Structures are given as C-alpha cells and as structure tokens.
C-alpha cells in the first residue's frame, strides 16, 4: 500500500440523547464514505443533529443540519459516489448506511436499520454495523412520531461522535 496518513477509522461511538451507539466501520471497502463520516464526526459537524425521520420497524435517520431531509453535504462540499460491495449487505439489523436521494448523491445524512432491509442493497452504501447499543437504536426507532412526517414529537439528537 501507498505511504501516508489517513483520516478513516474502523470504529466510532455515536453519543445520542438516549444512549451510546457503538459502530464498527468498513473503511477498506468504503474509504470515501468512512472518511466523510469520520471527518465530519471529528469536526463536530453532526453535533446536535436530530434523528429527523424515524420509521418503526424500519430505520432511524439523521445527519441533516437543517433537520428537513433536504440538507447536509460531504466533507468535499457536495455529493459523492456510492461504494457498493457484494460482501456488504443490509442482511442483518443495525446496519449503518448512507441516506442519499438517488445514485451517487451521498452527502452527510445516514441511517441505521432495525431489521434486515435487503431491498436497499446496491441502492445505499453500507459503511458500518452496530456492535453495542443495538437496544438504543431500537428504543429510538420506537419514539412517538407525527404519522404524516415520521418526525418525532420530542427531538432525539446526536450529542457528539467519538472516532476511535
């Protein structure tokens, strides 16, 4: 491999208003995606973000500074490529993936599933998996939301994210 320093890591802890979510990351398979996530995290970019879209029995979504689903961008200043990999699947719960609004439109928003979601394979970049705090993800997924918007009545937020 080429020499030089990197900004990726293979683990992080997302410290939320309802507890800690420990995430293993996949920087070998998804280097751009893990770098984006790690650099935003260390920079404090996700600090105070809400989980603005929560769908019981599906997934919890966050990472938009505006909280609307329309906002956020990559550490490069816009959108970046999908990093699909055949070994990385939404075949188990608590998979960490990029949100996006179409192919190659990754910004800053991401989600964590609470069940297998195989229909998202090769549509959303899988870049991590929860290793501790699965119960936190589950509990977040069960907060009361506005049925029309899937937005929780009481905010659930990221405090900060510690990258190992």
Task: Return the CATH number at 119.
Answer: 2.40.100.10
Name the domain count of the chain.
1
Give the closest residue to 127 by CA, choosing from 102, 99, 153.
99
Residues 6+ apart with CB under 8 A from 159: 15, 16, 17, 47, 48
Catalytic residue among 96, 124, 127, 129: 124
Asked how this structure was determined, the answer is X-ray
Task: Pull the structure tokens for residue 33.
Answer: 């995606």
129's enclosing H/E stretch is: strand 126-132
Identify whether 25 is a catalytic site residue: no
Q: DSSP E strands: which ranges in 8-82?
A: 11-16, 19-25, 53-55, 59-62
Q: SS3 for 119?
A: helix
The 10 Å Cβ neighbour count of residue 128 is 27
Identify whether 51 is a catalytic site residue: no
The experimental resolution of this structure, in angstroms, equals 1.6
Identify whether 110 is a catalytic site residue: no
Radius of gyration over every alpha carbon of the chain, rounded to an integer in angstroms: 15
Catalytic residue among 22, 25, 40, 61: 61
Q: SS3 for 76?
A: coil
Domain that holds residue 59: 1-164
Through-space distance between the first and last CA atoms of the chain, rounded to whole angstroms: 22
């Amino acid at each position: 491999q080429a020499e030089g320093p990197k900004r990726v890591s293979d683990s992080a802890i997302i410290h939320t208003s309802m507890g800690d979510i420990h995430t293993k990351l996949f920087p070998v398979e998804c280097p751009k995606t893990v770098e984006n996530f790690c650099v935003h995290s260390r920079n404090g970019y996700y600090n105070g973000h809400t989980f603005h879209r929560i769908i019981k029995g599906f997934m919890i979504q966050t990472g938009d500074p505006t909280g609307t689903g329309m906002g956020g961008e990559s550490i490069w200043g816009g959108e970046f490529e999908d990093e699909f990999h055949s070994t990385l699947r939404h075949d188990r719960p608590y998979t960490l993936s990029m949100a996006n609004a179409g192919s190659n439109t990754n910004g800053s928003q991401f989600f964590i599933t609470v069940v297998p979601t195989p229909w998202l394979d090769n549509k959303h970049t899988v870049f991590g998996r929860v290793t501790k705090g699965m119960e936190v993800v589950q509990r977040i997924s069960n907060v009361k939301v506005n049925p029309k918007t899937d937005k929780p009545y009481e905010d659930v937020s990221i405090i900060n994210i510690t990258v190992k």
